[PDB]
Design a binder for this molecule. Structure first.
Ligand SMILES: [Cl-]
Ligand SMILES: [Cl-]
Ligand SMILES: [Cl-]
Ligand SMILES: [Cl-]
Lengths: 294, 297, 299, 296
């Protein structure tokens, strides 16, 4: 119930030699707090966790909890393929003072659903009271959950939310219908208004980094019966999303954060390549415009 | 596309009644048309996927169009789905739909063979030509037709001279918004019934659906609620529609709908055409019960 | 399977010639049945996807079948593809196939609508009853049908009474082995012409193909070469098969095959039925150059 | 220059103990069991080796031991792939340090990178290999990448690349790659189509199931060479009787459980989240083991 809301998928700022840029991480953490964000989702896919070591991920959970613990909600994405490695991160989450833990369906190899459940159970054990945020992610990983299976995942003792990273809003409504109390995060930014309409009660997203007030603006708008306002705001979010998909989403976002003075050097880690120099005009212009809106 | 304004709304994908010898049941087709009209439906999409077009002849599909037009022309809006894999067979139907006085035509993207997009484009231009003044509704339905469109291609498609409308049989609500942003005036039908409210909010301004045959007023209710900023009524109606869709998925959709309409005394014989099988007997009390829920409501 | 042994072989999937009015070209059709029997081909697979069945009416399809029965009956094996979405339509074509003296019938898995496995099986059973003794070739093409059967579903399918062959248009040569393991006397046609050599080794005991029309003797050469334990020539014949398929893919497979026959002066008009478009102007040189190529090595 | 890498390369399993720790005794044992089956070389730290539930140090430790047990005696290829370029670069440098003959890397996964980004990945690793040939992947089914033919041609021609691991069941494309690159070291990666894949143009393979019946695959390689098509098909069928079971049981564990009953690996476990093999299949697996021992 306290995990309900709009939660930024925190990006990982890197210095010129691809190491963790501490000062930029803190500025980005604070930049997000200033936006009226309800929380931070730290070390997810978005934070480039799958190109960081366990110690590099752990250094972030630390530096972020130090910056923002108590001021806004904090969810530690601890997911790895290896259960054991995930269990270490869950244990470090419980130390640093996070409010919750999360884990992507373990990927790369074919694991049965029953292996998934035992994977989450072991991380719930190592989490030590922290609620778990489960994934329904039939895309990036490559698995295909049904609906009885989803009911089993979300009612595993110790599970307190679902990150529904799917554009299937029939499935969303079904979830909400079965679990009226469930904390239920809309995972895809470019359908957020429709996802809340179908059953979600918040979201986790990467683009919240640069326009989080617009998502909070949509929440308010639908809450107040202002449907034209919700649509107009979502259309503004998608205008930004069209661009970012063209430029590469994480690097496009870091670059917009560079023109906003928050992130010193906009780089993603290799094998991600640079933002194509031809998109710099549009991106600085977007930063300008988003700076004009506050 | 602002000249196609009067095609806006909730259109039932009319089923085609068959008798126990698998022949057209014309008495029940007329009953079904009229029942759809009593329900306050905005119009009818005739001979679609839903109306089992692909297991009927051109002559059979033509007989259906004529009987619907006879019953309902001038009363509610009428859309003839004339699409075949063949462009010429398609044209034969677009001409007849004109002859019967239909308000518009439609065509599924021709399927099975791997047609290039500009071949798709020539297929359609030719049907609009044969349609002799009637506006056209184009498609996606990748799920059944196996045709995957890019954004650029969908723009060209809906901006071809004579296109009044897009049936968007796609659950991708990001693309719905992108279509709406680029085309504020376009008529944009939500194809998937189980996301209707969400599709409207993403930018659709109506829908075509198979379940509107049995609870069209609920879908109409959702349109009104969203216009009047009433999300709680919208969500409620969508949940009740999805409770039924849930059931219809278990039973087989077309034949579940036909059985509910049989228990509603509209459709004499609830069969779909082979190779479709009959409703599993175990499901009939649920469907009867449902018919009795819906009729009382 | 036992009774279908006589349908083991290399069978050209016949194309359907059309004139300038999009109507059927009857003399070119007969020009092709003849051109095919002089390649040493074991038979003809008639009215299939390749014969453009799905943009013709029932009437048009029967007409094609009746003609082919005039020209071939007895000489080369004759398989009629009678498959439609509708079971009742498929049955009409099946009965007609029996009337005209075909050796076999076949139907693609019914498509567009998601039908159940049980619904597929009843579809075949009805069609077979209407063929009235003519064995059935179950036709399996996932890429275009959208119908995706399990192995168990395929084993049940190929053992329905009256089924004597599987047409396997799949590149999954694991499954091609598995079906042979389970059914050692099934007539098993390789359906992707570009893997014929590999498919034979995995377990196809023959094939059905669009490209056999123009170069069917090469596939007999593979069967022969593998028979002779001659890996070299078989690989050679397949690379040569694939060189043509490469271009046939670029141009458009059906119309390319038709055009090649148009420069072989077998087809008057190399067009396909709309929505199929004409070929790009720029490929005519290669198609014309290829038609010349194949006659030289043949006759 | 390429041809020395040509042949039948087992994708080596990584044995673990009851605590998931690397089992070095069982790895030594398994490396020797491979060599004496008659294998041409070993593919170390691949997907088959549970690379993606190991840390870099664990992967380096495995590579070092195999190179000690096998340097000079058979070809060794070190799979050095990770998502991260820099992590892959460390592993590649380590492989060079340990005396491997080649390195490999799976197309980087999870995030969608571009084909340009994949090639730059391959460049950075190749550089870090400092002279070791690179084995590239064409993988549509386990990584999500959807490479084209012209892209594969660009891949196989990058400076330093000396082989393609064709982990695709598309034998039209196999034929197509061999026709375009008649010298290329081309490994069949889908074990259950090996013979057919050789006929389309592969000149060797890399597979997990070579750990228990590698002699069958060299026996298929031999049978085709002489033009004994019959024995080639008999062997592929026996390989697929095995591959059917392993698919039921779980391929890596299935395979380890058989090596356990061959007294090769002590503890037949995969790392979590892989569970153990179902106890019902243990009768079948023991039998396969006894069978395969008695068969040589
Ligand atoms: Cl994330
Ligand atoms: Cl429809
Ligand atoms: Cl065919
Ligand atoms: Cl591997």
């Amino acid at each position: 119930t306290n995990l309900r809301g709009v939660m930024a998928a925190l990006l990982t700022p890197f210095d010129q030699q691809q190491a963790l840029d501490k000062a930029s991480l803190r500025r980005l953490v604070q930049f997000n707090i200033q936006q009226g964000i309800d929380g931070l989702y730290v070390g997810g896919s978005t934070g480039e966790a799958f190109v960081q070591s366990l110690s590099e991920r752990e250094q972030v959970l630390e530096i972020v909890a130090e910056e923002a613990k108590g001021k806004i909600k904090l969810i530690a994405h601890v997911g790895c393929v290896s259960t054991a490695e995930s269990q270490q991160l869950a244990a470090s989450a419980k130390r640093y003072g996070f409010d919750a833990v999360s884990a992507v369906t373990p990927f790369y190899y074919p694991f049965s659903f029953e292996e998934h459940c035992d994977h989450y159970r072991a991380i719930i054990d190592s989490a030590d009271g922290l609620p778990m945020v489960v994934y329904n992610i039939p895309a990036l990983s490559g698995v295909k959950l049904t609906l009885d299976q989803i009911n089993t995942l979300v009612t595993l003792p110790g599970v307190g939310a679902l990150k529904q990273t799917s554009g299937d809003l029939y499935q969303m409504e079904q979830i909400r219908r079965e679990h009226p109390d469930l904390v239920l995060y809309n995972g895809y930014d470019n359908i957020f208004a429709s996802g809340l309409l179908a059953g979600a009660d918040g979201g986790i997203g990467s683009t919240y980094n640069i326009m989080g007030w617009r998502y909070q603006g949509i929440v308010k708008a639908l809450k107040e019966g202002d449907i034209q306002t919700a649509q107009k705001l979502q259309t503004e979010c998608n205008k930004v999303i069209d661009l970012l998909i063209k430029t590469g989403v994480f690097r496009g976002l870091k670059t917009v954060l560079h023109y906003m003075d928050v992130v010193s050097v906009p780089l993603c880690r290799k094998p991600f390549g640079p933002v194509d120099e031809k998109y710099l005009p549009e991106l600085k212009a977007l930063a300008q415009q988003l700076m004009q809106e506050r």
